């Protein structure tokens, strides 16, 4: 069809995107695939490099031993965009670089050797938000190390500028990572890489906003997930939505260079709950989570589910499960039952969620979506179908507006709809 979205210049937030037509919630708006991509640090050998699904067994690249892959097809078909890193992560092993050098590496490849990608329509890298002139003193530093990695990960086959875009400034080019970078989740919700996405990277952030995106392998759809009017902006949350507005704050200043003046940031709007219980205990709690969530990205569950249920279940004082940070131990604890097949357990974590997700994700949103359907899975395959039921029909009312056809979860949870309605059929 036509574009339901265009490009525009807002009054206060550089450029934006805007709707063409009035667009109603699960409405697909764009899709996506990525200008370059990665596998993200936890995830490297244990998903594929290209489709960036799991796998009992992974196949390495031959020549660098770092690229992973599900089948030959996914190796093959990677080899053109994997090529000219081979000899850069094979050059330069046992380092590894940061994801944010990979994916750079791999910009400038698709920059110089293919064709004008798709995922550049309505934006290109080029025209990418650096803020430079808000970057401070200690980012710049850190940028300038950036640089200096990429020279040294690149140097087999980046030497000097003639092997970069005309006038490419790495310093600007990292600048640009660092605010446009999308982090891609797996259907699971867990995190599996980052890519960058320059037509998508229009949409500006909000604290409530009218938009979402979801991931299906490296391809992004955009959604509505409210009523947009002709001309109004389109939005998406930036940030994990268990989050203080003070956590929002620093995020939205240190990544992105700016300020929300917001109806919830100006009201603290859920910051009280969020924080209910000792602060004590909700302090450790948060340092607790460094680790466990260090281990969960890299696919550790015994020692996440060790670490948890010595929150959960401590001798000691407890939290409220509406508290962000118990919450956030749910849900890993949860994650963590279910890819070890501890499944009643998975269930009893699962369900604590459940309250404080309706709170935290309002209207339709991905996060609440998928979570709600992980439960009511699990209550399917337990016999309990009124329950579940209940849940997968609420996981669908979200899920058709934040996934939708066009994503194979949906699939997924139709089966899960079509089977728990025949057991109630016959009971
Ligand atoms: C909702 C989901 C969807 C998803 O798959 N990824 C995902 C991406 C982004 C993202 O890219 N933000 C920056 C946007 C660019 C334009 C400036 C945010 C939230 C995400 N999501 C999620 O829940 N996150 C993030 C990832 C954490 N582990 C926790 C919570
Ligand atoms: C992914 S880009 C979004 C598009 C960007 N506005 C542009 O002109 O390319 C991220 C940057 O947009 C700006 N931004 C996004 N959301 C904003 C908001 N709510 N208020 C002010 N600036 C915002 C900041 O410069 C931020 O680092
Ligand atoms: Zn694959
Ligand atoms: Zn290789
Ligand atoms: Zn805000």
Redesign the pocket.
């Known amino acids: 069809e036509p574009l339901k979205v265009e490009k525009f ?2 009054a ?6 805007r709707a063409v037509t009035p667009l109603r919630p699960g409405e697909l708006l764009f899709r996506s695939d990525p200008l370059a991509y990665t596998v993200c640090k936890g995830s490297r050998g244990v998903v594929c490099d290209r489709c960036l699904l799991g796998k009992e067994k992974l196949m390495r690249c031959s020549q660098c031993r770092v690229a992973k892959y599900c089948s030959a097809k996914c190796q093959k078909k990677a080899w053109p965009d994997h090529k000219r890193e081979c000899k850069c992560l094979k050059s330069c092993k046992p380092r590894y670089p940061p994801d944010s050098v990979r994916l750079l590496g791999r910009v400038v490849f698709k920059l110089m050797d293919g064709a004008p990608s798709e995922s550049e329509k309505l ?1 290109s890298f080029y ?3 650096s ?1 430079i002139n ?1 970057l401070t003193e200690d980012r710049k530093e850190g940028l300038r190390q950036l640089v200096m990695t990429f020279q040294h990960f690149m140097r087999e086959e980046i030497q000097d500028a003639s092997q970069l875009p005309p006038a490419f400034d790495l310093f600007e080019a990292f600048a640009k990572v ?3 970078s999308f982090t891609i989740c797996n259907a699971e919700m867990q995190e599996v890489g980052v890519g960058l996405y320059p037509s ?8 409530d906003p009218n938009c979402s995106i979801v991931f299906n392998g490296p391809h992004l759809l955009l959604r509505a997930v409210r009523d947009i009017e002709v001309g109004e902006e389109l ?1 998406i949350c ?1 940030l994990d939505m268990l989050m203080t507005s003070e956590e929002r704050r620093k995020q ?1 200043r240190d ?6 003046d ?1 109806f919830r940031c100006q009201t603290q709007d859920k910051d009280a709950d969020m924080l209910t219980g000792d602060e004590q205990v909700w302090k450790e709690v948060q340092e607790s989570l460094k680790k466990i969530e260090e281990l969960k990205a890299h696919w550790k569950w015994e020692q996440v589910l060790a670490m948890c249920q010595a929150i959960i279940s401590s001798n000691s004082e407890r939290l409220p499960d509406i508290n962000i940070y118990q919450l956030k131990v749910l849900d890993c604890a949860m994650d963590a039952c279910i890819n070890l097949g501890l499944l009643e357990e998975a269930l009893f974590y699962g369900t604590r969620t459940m309250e404080p997700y309706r709170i935290f994700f309002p209207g339709s949103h991905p996060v609440r979506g998928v979570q709600v359907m992980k439960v009511g899975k699990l209550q399917l395959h337990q016999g309990m179908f009124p329950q579940a039921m209940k849940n997968l029909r609420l996981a669908f009312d979200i899920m058709r507006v934040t996934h939708g056809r066009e994503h194979s979860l949906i699939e997924d949870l139709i089966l899960l709809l079509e089977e728990c309605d025949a057991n109630i059929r016959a009971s």
Do not use: M, P
């Open positions: 210049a807002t206060n937030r550089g450029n934006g995107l934006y025209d990418l938000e803020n808000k660092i605010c446009n998508i990277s229009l949409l500006n952030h909000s604290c939005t930036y939205l990544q992105y260079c700016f300020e929300c917001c």
